[PDB]
Write a protein that binds this ligand. Structure first.
Ligand SMILES: *[C@@H]1O[C@H](CO)[C@@H](O[C@@H]2O[C@H](CO)[C@@H](O)[C@H](O)[C@H]2NC(C)=O)[C@H](O)[C@H]1NC(C)=O
Ligand SMILES: *[C@@H]1O[C@H](CO)[C@@H](O[C@@H]2O[C@H](CO)[C@@H](O)[C@H](O)[C@H]2NC(C)=O)[C@H](O)[C@H]1NC(C)=O
Ligand SMILES: *[C@@H]1O[C@H](CO)[C@@H](O[C@@H]2O[C@H](CO)[C@@H](O)[C@H](O)[C@H]2NC(C)=O)[C@H](O)[C@H]1NC(C)=O
Ligand SMILES: *[C@@H]1O[C@H](CO)[C@@H](O[C@@H]2O[C@H](CO)[C@@H](O)[C@H](O)[C@H]2NC(C)=O)[C@H](O)[C@H]1NC(C)=O
Ligand SMILES: *[C@@H]1O[C@H](CO)[C@@H](O[C@@H]2O[C@H](CO)[C@@H](O)[C@H](O)[C@H]2NC(C)=O)[C@H](O)[C@H]1NC(C)=O
Ligand SMILES: *[C@@H]1O[C@H](CO)[C@@H](O[C@@H]2O[C@H](CO)[C@@H](O)[C@H](O)[C@H]2NC(C)=O)[C@H](O)[C@H]1NC(C)=O
Ligand SMILES: *[C@@H]1O[C@H](CO)[C@@H](O[C@H]2O[C@H](CO)[C@@H](O)[C@H](O)[C@H]2NC(C)=O)[C@H](O)[C@H]1NC(C)=O
Ligand SMILES: *[C@@H]1O[C@H](CO)[C@@H](O[C@H]2O[C@H](CO)[C@@H](O)[C@H](O)[C@H]2NC(C)=O)[C@H](O)[C@H]1NC(C)=O
Ligand SMILES: *[C@H]1O[C@H](CO)[C@@H](O[C@@H]2O[C@H](CO)[C@@H](O)[C@H](O)[C@H]2NC(C)=O)[C@H](O)[C@H]1NC(C)=O
Ligand SMILES: N[C@@H](CC(=O)N1CCCNC(=O)C1CC(F)(F)F)Cc1cc(F)c(F)cc1F
Ligand SMILES: N[C@@H](CC(=O)N1CCCNC(=O)C1CC(F)(F)F)Cc1cc(F)c(F)cc1F
Ligand SMILES: *[C@@H]1O[C@H](CO)[C@@H](O)[C@H](O)[C@H]1NC(C)=O
Ligand SMILES: *[C@@H]1O[C@H](CO)[C@@H](O)[C@H](O)[C@H]1NC(C)=O
Ligand SMILES: *[C@@H]1O[C@H](CO)[C@@H](O)[C@H](O)[C@H]1NC(C)=O
Ligand SMILES: *[C@@H]1O[C@H](CO)[C@@H](O)[C@H](O)[C@H]1NC(C)=O
Ligand SMILES: *[C@@H]1O[C@H](CO)[C@@H](O)[C@H](O)[C@H]1NC(C)=O
Ligand SMILES: *[C@@H]1O[C@H](CO)[C@@H](O)[C@H](O)[C@H]1NC(C)=O
Ligand code: NA
Lengths: 728, 728
């Protein structure tokens, strides 16, 4: 009898999934790390060489957290002293190593505690943010040029984002953009002067006698948001003037009438930049295309080149307006937008014409535009087999839209239905990354003829190990509700037997544009629960889920805490009606948005669930951040949508928690979903006399990802689940 | 067959203990509130008259929290708008009603948010504190005089204590002391300028969008402490034209050499005041005796009248140097101090004489001095039957110390072994309050011949109700350890059968000078645990406990977390060896200091305990307040006692928790034992991979006493204990 996939296996990573992370440094060479050694590979022949021996920094006196080679290969940026902050932000120290002279630079070093640094796209110019101010170095060993003087901790951010812009808008800490050949440096400036502060205690190491109070500007729903400004400085003039001028590009009149956001920055050419602005009521965005005026050194955006993008049924974009992809001459661009049927497709735009032309269509959607050459546009979509949970790479002929080739569909249809792609500098080569439903597979391909060059990593090692293990199986299918298909997936125990009644755990996220039913292969907690505990773990994408058209995604518009909650309850009913589910043992759990939904479900009084676990849940929308909350709920005022804000809290369903077993967990240093949210749930439960289980994690954030806490929380949830299901 | 004392009975107070709280207003009469009516009683005969009708304030508007009748019976201070702060502090609104003219006063009324107010001991003058400043009103309807102007929130405290002085020194918010006839008003002034602040979150009602941050000047061990000054002001010579003049009495030189505290203020006569000062290293105190000089108007404290009290084995006094009891003329006084054998007895002092004379002696202790006349001194001790957990009222003839008469011992030996007393003004009458082992019994007596006048309240109603309940019994006995006897108590289930094995729960506090083994009758959680769950609840008084001499109490000096912890493990070990205890089911629980001991026991690796519960425990002494911690631990510096501060923590024992079941509870708004303490405990367990149970209580402080929380915590603990014991 083969062993099963146990909890320890999951927590200890005994069965390691291999990947192949490469970095294109040109149109046909990439870097790969093998044995702490940085090797350079020739894509065409697969032959390589040592780019940087591991023994190169033995006597550095510091552990190098990451590296970055300048575009011209002349220098390398060494990052150490990594200090994590939020999801993407962190501070670190940096040193530059001169590859040709093989000497480490020791003059005019990058300051310690630098918030962000990036090479220019070409050459070896450097731009970094320190103490909230931007600096540029034309040469690694020369003095820096200061670009801004207004930077102020927690107040003015130049070149970097504030908490909400980092988390909800740019998904990055940096807020600066080098133009294509590096002449100009554009950046955003955020002013959080009047933004309220979230405050919580951080206890730190046992040696700290007095707890520290963390204070970060964070706008909750309906609160004062940060204002923003955009500028562009010409770095080429830095060595000719004492103080180079940052030219401001003001937002359009349609945005200045009220609160708004800068939501996208994309350079089109060396002298044309595009910007998208979004109104605080996120259903109206504007794109300005601005050209450099050489005579006045100013930037002008002709209204004839201004493009409007709005929505009548919801917000704009899946999570925000999509990014434009310009043709070489910068006179036209491709952008994904939802069509008249509500499906997201690629529209072709002339920069000075408002009507665009869709180049793809159908009851499926384009996930993203991956590359654009003078002849072809490549993109990933879920068109194949009508599976919204699948992903494939396509190629469309620019001179004939009826010519579309699927570059990955048939490569290995039984093992690979979820693809990701990585193109070389000029798209001459591309690495395909298959992540499911079989073992991940990485392959390298040639664009000139779309031929497979070779297999980079097939995970044979793991496949070998997984042979002596009773692995669970995965079922991806759908059920029909109101003439509409709704997908679900099930992690089934080994030797599944449909004649038996298995306990069921509904794994839920269910946030707007989410997708929990897909063809991806994962080794996670559900693997253990299904393999060792013979527990069926299920997920369901109901109303509000993504990649299936706006009719489904925008169904929860201004109504969070309703349909996506009910549909989840309905999904459980349908499952127990499949005959292999023990209706007496049905649980539900989720994290983040999932915790909210789990809590809302447990408080519905449906009688369908026996117990449930919520990890770091939202409890009332007024406690979450403005950008994300208002996108779906509008403003919490009586003139807008306050009644629903008050009607969709977890606390108001406290009395119904008497019918179930609840486990509430939250990290105390959670800067995203504040502990406050679970503190209010627990108080509501205590207030109506409801018993439940709770667990706080000291100094842990939204991810509760520290190694020990990660193991502690899943171990704790396992006991609770096993107990609720009466499992030995 | 009949009902048992259930958890609901404990939580809903089904069985209420009746009391008889009277207030002496002279040497012959007292006030007693009955049916919301205030009656005046004649002690000699028991006849009464209505002093103030309950309906007198029907249309008052506000709900009266409490009342206070001026010493001359002319006025009544009405308290409303009560808002609790710490253990003793609070603010409220006050109104003064004229009893003579049966009219409420509307002119020059006491401000709102008043921090403290008190009548003068004689007549009807008033002294109140508002915005940290002292005010005085000679007549209820006249404008008040500002005494201090330095009052500054969280910085300068005039007439009221800061956090630590309130909690650890005076056990009161008040820092005002009227001279006997009200001529003088002495007060202390606290300066917390450099005292670090403890900060934590307060969430409030769910309507509060942003959590509030509470900040309180709180000196942890080793931190900067507040400084203090003492003043005396003549209130008979106040002017509305000139600012009042305060005369400062500085501390003795032996104190000014370093950090110190003002630990006691006691007026001797109309013109003589005594103050005791304590060095930061709490084993050396000094009493100054100051006389008013009618010539200069200054207060002079003759060095010849200075009295030093020190300890070579520990700190001075039980929790602080005891209070002196002066004779009528104020030339001599009585005070409890430990004798050469280490037992606390009454010493008689001459104000200008260095050697005092002990008037009581023996291997037992005087608890407190209760009354003094020219012929007798009345006191309470635990001498009777050599039971350190019993209390009785005695009187000793001042002209012949060999004549000691016990006044309560034989009143009702089977029902009453624990007395408390309340004398009238000149000690002409006294009320005896028996609180165990039987039901509380209140009686009135006459001092002239120690006659028992009458029974005020015998709780015969409760007695009748308890007859239909299967109530548990209490066993008080001792065990021997190294020639020394240590007492313990066991709450035994109904129909106790020593031939059966009962699970056992150790109820522990064990702080320095604590006593958890006594003859007091209580209806609490343990009553329910024994009566309904058939669990034995034991408590043990080991090394470090009080009322048994310094050899036992000072055993833990400079070494907390050692002997008192080891002694509990020994008691349990010994109880486990008794025939009626199931050694496979032994548990331990505690709150505050008891939470610390419980945690230290569970992390000892003794193997005696299966599970335990810790509520708001101290986890490392550097986190607790200075005045209390340093009293027993000295300073946490390497030249003093830092090493023991570092190895007396719970965190260091984390690894040993693997073999027990632990439930850790704590209120998030705990201003006493900061949540930080449990937060560091949880983080430590997480770090070594130990699973445990937790529960935080949103916005609850150290007593987790709000109605809903109190029911919730005990419900949750009851479930945990029953599950640990396999009890249905
Ligand atoms: C990968 O292999 C190719 C071809 O084998 C290498 O090309 C070299 O091209 C230069 C041209 O100046 C010749 O002098 C070398 O002799 C060629 N090498 C060989 C082996 O023929 C290329 O350098 C290799 N790249 C890497 C990264 O190893
Ligand atoms: C950031 O925004 C704040 C306003 O929220 C600006 O501060 C104001 O500046 C004006 C002009 O200097 C003053 O008259 C006001 O007193 C300021 N108001 C406040 C609330 O501080 C600030 O100048 C902006 N900073 C930048 C760099 O744009
Ligand atoms: C470089 O130029 C900028 C922009 O003119 C200067 O910033 C101004 O600084 C003055 C005071 O030093 C302020 O009154 C202005 O409000 C600032 N404007 C901006 C946009 O920040 C900056 O000080 C200059 N640096 C040097 C060294 O001259
Ligand atoms: C990058 O693009 C910029 C902008 O077009 C180039 O700068 C211009 O260079 C031309 C020379 O053909 C001059 O006429 C202009 O004065 C420059 N404009 C500005 C704003 O500086 C720049 O030469 C390009 N860089 C490289 C390396 O080719
Ligand atoms: C309270 O005691 C004070 C102090 O002994 C009394 O005030 C003194 O009274 C005498 C007699 O009239 C005066 O000659 C002194 O000048 C007063 N001394 C001071 C410091 O004021 C006061 O009379 C007593 N109060 C009552 C109500 O008896
Ligand atoms: C009061 O306690 C202190 C501290 O225990 C005693 O002072 C000295 O403290 C240091 C550091 O712990 C020791 O090395 C000394 O042995 C202690 N004694 C002396 C004389 O230095 C102090 O003695 C105690 N005071 C009394 C009256 O017992
Ligand atoms: C208790 O009873 C006595 C009666 O013996 C009351 O009488 C005393 O006081 C009265 C006024 O307060 C007078 O009218 C009596 O003359 C006086 N008698 C004696 C012997 O002192 C006394 O007041 C009563 N006390 C109360 C509180 O009701
Ligand atoms: C309260 O105590 C403070 C601190 O001991 C006194 O001020 C002193 O400390 C300040 C801050 O550390 C210094 O800035 C001052 O120079 C120092 N002395 C003075 C006179 O301020 C402060 O005066 C005290 N206040 C009262 C009313 O006693
Ligand atoms: C303390 O506050 C109370 C309530 O605010 C004051 O009482 C009055 O309350 C009414 C409304 O209830 C207000 O309009 C008045 O301004 C308040 N003052 C008066 C004189 O009516 C109360 O007066 C305050 N205490 C003091 C000493 O002023
Ligand atoms: N804050 C939101 C960010 C977000 O949704 N993305 C970044 C912006 C674009 N979109 C994405 O795909 C994600 C990824 C993911 F979070 F997974 F949705 C996530 C988020 C939602 C929520 F309801 C919580 F209570 C907590 C939380 F962290
Ligand atoms: N802070 C201490 C106050 C104290 O002990 N008293 C006030 C001063 C004089 N003494 C007493 O008798 C008490 C009564 C009691 F607290 F019950 F001991 C109590 C205390 C001790 C401890 F270890 C904690 F973690 C929390 C706590 F609240
Ligand atoms: C490079 O260093 C790593 C780690 O020290 C080691 O595994 C590897 O053997 C080294 N490179 C080679 C070619 O051995
Ligand atoms: C960065 O910090 C280190 C450690 O303090 C210091 O030695 C070094 O000089 C610093 N480098 C710079 C550029 O400030
Ligand atoms: C944008 O959303 C608001 C809120 O529902 C709505 O009133 C307004 O008409 C919308 N604009 C468009 C173009 O739909
Ligand atoms: C005073 O009011 C209480 C209730 O508040 C009531 O029980 C009592 O009867 C009243 N007093 C009298 C003398 O009736
Ligand atoms: C009393 O002292 C205060 C505090 O300095 C001052 O402001 C006030 O004017 C003084 N009043 C008189 C009458 O001197
Ligand atoms: C006496 O008993 C105590 C505990 O009460 C123990 O610690 C000690 O070692 C024993 N012996 C002596 C000499 O104190
Ligand atoms: Na009698």
């Amino acid at each position: 009898t083969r062993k099963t996939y146990t909890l320890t296996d999951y927590l200890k990573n005994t069965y390691r999934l291999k990947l192949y992370s490469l970095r294109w440094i040109s149109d046909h060479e990439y870097l790969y790390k093998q044995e702490n050694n940085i090797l350079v590979f020739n894509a065409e022949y697969g032959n390589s060489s040592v780019f940087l021996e591991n023994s190169t920094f033995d006597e550095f006196g510091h552990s190098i957290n990451d590296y970055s080679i300048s575009p011209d290969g002349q220098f390398i940026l060494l990052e150490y002293n990594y200090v994590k902050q939020w999801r993407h932000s962190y501070t670190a120290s940096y040193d530059i190593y001169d590859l040709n002279k093989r000497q480490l630079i020791t003059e005019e070093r990058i300051p310690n505690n630098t918030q962000w640094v990036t090479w220019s796209p070409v050459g070896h110019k450097l731009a970094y943010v320190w103490n909230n101010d931007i600096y540029v170095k034309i040469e690694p060993n020369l003095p820096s040029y200061r670009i801004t003087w207004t930077g102020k901790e927690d107040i003015i951010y130049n070149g970097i984002t504030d908490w909400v812009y980092e988390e909800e808008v740019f998904s990055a800490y940096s807020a600066l953009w080098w133009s294509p050949n590096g002449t100009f440096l554009a950046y955003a400036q955020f002013n959080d002067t009047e933004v309220p502060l979230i405050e919580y205690s951080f206890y730190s190491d046992e040696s700290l006698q007095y707890p520290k109070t963390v204070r970060v500007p964070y706008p909750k729903a309906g609160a004062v948001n940060p204002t923003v400004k955009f500028f562009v400085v010409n770095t080429d003039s830095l060595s000719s003037v004492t103080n180079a001028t940052s030219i401001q590009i003001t937002a359009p009149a349609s945005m200045l009438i009220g609160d708004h956001y800068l939501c996208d920055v994309t350079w089109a050419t060396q002298e044309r930049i595009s910007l998208q602005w979004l109104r605080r009521i996120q259903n109206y965005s504007v794109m300005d295309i601005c050209d450099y005026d050489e005579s006045s050194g100013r930037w002008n955006c002709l209204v004839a080149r201004q493009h409007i993008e709005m929505s009548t049924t919801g917000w704009v974009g899946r999570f925000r307006p999509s990014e434009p992809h310009f043709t070489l001459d910068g006179n036209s661009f491709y952008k994904i937008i939802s069509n008249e049927e509500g499906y997201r497709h690629i529209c072709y735009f002339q920069i000075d014409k408002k009507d665009c032309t869709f180049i793809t269509k159908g009851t499926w959607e384009v996930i993203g535009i991956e590359a654009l050459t003078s002849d072809y546009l490549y993109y990933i979509s879920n068109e194949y087999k009508g599976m919204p949970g699948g992903r494939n790479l396509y190629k469309i002929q620019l001179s004939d839209y009826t010519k579309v080739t699927c570059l990955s569909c048939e490569l290995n249809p039984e093992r690979c239905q979820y693809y990701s792609v990585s193109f070389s500098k000029e798209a001459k080569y591309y690495q395909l990354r298959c992540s499911g439903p079989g073992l991940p597979l990485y392959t390298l391909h040639s664009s000139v003829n779309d031929k497979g060059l070779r297999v980079l990593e097939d995970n044979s090692a793991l496949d070998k190990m997984l042979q002596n293990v009773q692995m669970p199986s995965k079922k991806l299918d759908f059920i029909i509700l109101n003439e509409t298909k709704f997908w679900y997936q099930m992690i089934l125990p080994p030797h599944f037997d449909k004649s038996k009644k298995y306990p069921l755990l509904l794994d839920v996220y269910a946030g707007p544009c989410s997708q929990k039913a897909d063809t991806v292969f994962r080794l996670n907690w559900a693997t253990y629960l299904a393999s060792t505990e013979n527990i069926i773990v299920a997920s369901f994408d109901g109303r509000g889920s993504g990649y299936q058209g706006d009719k489904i995604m925008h169904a929860i518009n201004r109504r969070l805490g309703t349909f996506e909650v009910e549909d989840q309850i309905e999904a459980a009913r349908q499952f127990s009606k499949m005959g292999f589910v023990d209706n007496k043992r049905i649980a539900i759990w989720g994290w983040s948005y999932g915790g909210y939904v789990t809590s809302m479900v447990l408080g519905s009084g449906s009688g369908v669930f026996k117990c449930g676990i919520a990890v770091a849940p939202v409890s009332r929308w007024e406690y979450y951040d403005s950008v994300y909350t208002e996108r779906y709920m509008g403003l919490p005022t009586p003139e807008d949508n306050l009644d629903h804000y008050r009607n969709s809290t977890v606390m108001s369903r406290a009395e119904n928690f008497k019918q179930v077993e609840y486990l509430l967990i939250h990290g105390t240093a959670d800067d995203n979903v504040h502990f406050q949210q679970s503190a209010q749930i627990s108080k509501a439960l205590v207030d109506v006399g409801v018993d439940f289980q709770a667990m706080w994690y000291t100094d842990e954030d939204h991810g509760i990802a520290s190694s020990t806490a990660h193991q502690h929380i899943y171990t704790h949830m396992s006991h609770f689940i096993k107990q609720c299901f009466s499992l030995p």
